[PDB]
Amino acid sequence: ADDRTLLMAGVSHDLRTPLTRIRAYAETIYNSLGELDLSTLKELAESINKDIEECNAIIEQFIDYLRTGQEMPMEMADLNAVLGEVIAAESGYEREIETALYPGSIEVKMHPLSIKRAVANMVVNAARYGNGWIKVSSGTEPNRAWFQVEDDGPGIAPEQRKHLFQPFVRGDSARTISGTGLGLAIVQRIVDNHNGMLELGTSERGGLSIRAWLPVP
Amino acid sequence: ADDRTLLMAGVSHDLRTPLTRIRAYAETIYNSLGELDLSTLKELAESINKDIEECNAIIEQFIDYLRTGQEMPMEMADLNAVLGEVIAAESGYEREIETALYPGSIEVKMHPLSIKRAVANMVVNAARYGNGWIKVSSGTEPNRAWFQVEDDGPGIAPEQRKHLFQPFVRGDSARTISGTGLGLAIVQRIVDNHNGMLELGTSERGGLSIRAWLPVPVT
Ligand SMILES: Nc1ncnc2c1ncn2[C@@H]1O[C@H](COP(=O)(O)OP(=O)(O)NP(=O)(O)O)[C@@H](O)[C@H]1O
Numbered sequence: 001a002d003d004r005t006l007l008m009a010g011v012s013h014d015l016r017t018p019l020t021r022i023r024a025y026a027e028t029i030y031n032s033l034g035e036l037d038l039s040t041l042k043e044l045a046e047s048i049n050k051d052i053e054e055c056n057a058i059i060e061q062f063i064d065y066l067r068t069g070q071e072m073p074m075e076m077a078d079l080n081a082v083l084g085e086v087i088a089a090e091s092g093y094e095r096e097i098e099t100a101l102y103p104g105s106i107e108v109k110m111h112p113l114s115i116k117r118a119v120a121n122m123v124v125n126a127a128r129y130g131n132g133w134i135k136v137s138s139g140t141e142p143n144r145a146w147f148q149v150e151d152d153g154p155g156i157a158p159e160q161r162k163h164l165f166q167p168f169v170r171g172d173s174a175r176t177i178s179g180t181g182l183g184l185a186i187v188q189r190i191v192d193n194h195n196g197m198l199e200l201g202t203s204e205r206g207g208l209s210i211r212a213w214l215p216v217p
Numbered sequence: 218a219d220d221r222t223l224l225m226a227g228v229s230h231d232l233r234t235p236l237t238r239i240r241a242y243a244e245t246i247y248n249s250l251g252e253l254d255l256s257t258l259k260e261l262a263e264s265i266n267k268d269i270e271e272c273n274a275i276i277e278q279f280i281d282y283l284r285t286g287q288e289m290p291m292e293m294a295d296l297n298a299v300l301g302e303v304i305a306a307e308s309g310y311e312r313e314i315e316t317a318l319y320p321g322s323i324e325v326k327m328h329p330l331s332i333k334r335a336v337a338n339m340v341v342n343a344a345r346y347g348n349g350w351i352k353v354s355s356g357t358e359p360n361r362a363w364f365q366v367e368d369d370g371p372g373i374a375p376e377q378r379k380h381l382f383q384p385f386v387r388g389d390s391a392r393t394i395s396g397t398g399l400g401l402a403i404v405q406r407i408v409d410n411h412n413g414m415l416e417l418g419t420s421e422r423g424g425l426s427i428r429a430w431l432p433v434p435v436t
């Protein structure tokens with residue numbers, strides 16, 4: 001109940017800077033219509049939008065974390081169709097995703113929406129820590145299935161590895177909350193609710209690789 | 218215990234509605250730049266400032282609740298004012314919202330922001346699951362006041378209703394459409410905290426007709 005409330009407080013705090021900045025751009029546009037170059041007027045509108053996206057990210061992230069607390073209806077579903085949907089949606093010209101999915105359907109018992117979120121957070125984390133390369137793959141063993149994401153980032157040592165699931169940041173870099181940390185903490189909790197486990201390591205290209213195991217019926 | 222959750226969900230969830238509207242205004246500027254004149258461009262910007270206030274309002278309400286312990290400070294306000302506010306915000310040049318409000322004002326004991334949130338949720342759904350037609354109406358009765366929103370969508374089959382008021386529960390029909398399964402859950406809680414009642418039904422055109430009744434005290 002309460003680790004959540006504290007977290008909600010952080011979210012509202014982190015929202016202040018983006019929000020103030022939007023009102024600000026909004027206000028100059030409002031007053032400077034006669035005045036402004038179309039180039040600049042566009043750069044305010046563009047920056048507004050970048051900021052709105054920042055907000056939606058944190059809010060969504062929190063809601064997802066919230067949902068993690070409650071029990072969800074499980075069903076049989078194809079892991080590769082879920083991954084496919086998320087990869088399309090996180091798929092951008094900004095970032096190119098390498099798809100290397102197991103070439104057969106994988107049935108696992110899951111709440112699809114929850115899985116979609118776990119995948120999505122892994123992707124954005126891999127887009128932050130990484131240098132642009134992201135690879136999503138899946139596969140299966142007799143007893144358990146898996147999906148994983150990989151970046152060409154710095155590659156996190158087993159020491160820092162533990163303090164990677166922390167939503168709150170020690171430094172107070174003017175931000176109460178780590179999006180990266182909260183994200184992975186969300187993933188951690190979703191995998192657990194599915195009776196799976198996470199497994200971290202180095203990728204093909206030296207970066208981070210996080211893999212999520214799930215039970216097959 | 219379960220309740221504290223839906224409070225928190227309600228805050229973050231309801232923050233998105235105004236932000237989203239912003240993305241709509243920002244983009245139209247970003248694209249329409251050559252074309253647009255003062256009068257409208259000035260309006261778009263004003264709309265962004267309104268909606269950013271709304272975000273702070275929502276944030277403020279939560280912080281107050283943290284110090285006060287009291288979440289929805291009640292008071293006598295004009296229901297219609299709040300309705301008109303939401304009708305204005307949510308209708309653009311693209312989208313037009315029909316109106317059958319009660320003439321004059323309706324004084325009700327409410328927490329105006331919270332109701333504004335409720336009405337918003339109802340109206341974004343009417344857009345989300347409807348086919349463009351949306352009608353907001355209000356009226357009053359001997360001891361009660363009401364507002365409803367109506368869409369021309371498929372409505373909600375009575376068998377489904379109780380199921381869909383639960384938090385984080387979406388519709389299979391909804392699966393197609395994006396979302397969170399929270400709007401109705403929130404609307405209910407807000408209306409409950411006002412000791413009101415929700416009444417679902419079929420709209421003028423076969424869609425959902427969702428109506429909130431509020432008590433009007435008597436000296
Ligand atoms: N106006 C409507 N017409 C038809 N169906 C509706 C309407 N409003 C809600 N529904 C259905 O009721 C379900 C519950 O909606 P709700 O709990 O409001 O969250 P949501 O609209 O799914 N997502 P969100 O608003 O983003 O949290 C939806 O998934 C729809 O199937």
Ligand SMILES: [Mg+2]
Nearest residue numbers: 338342400401
């Ligand atoms: Mg809704």
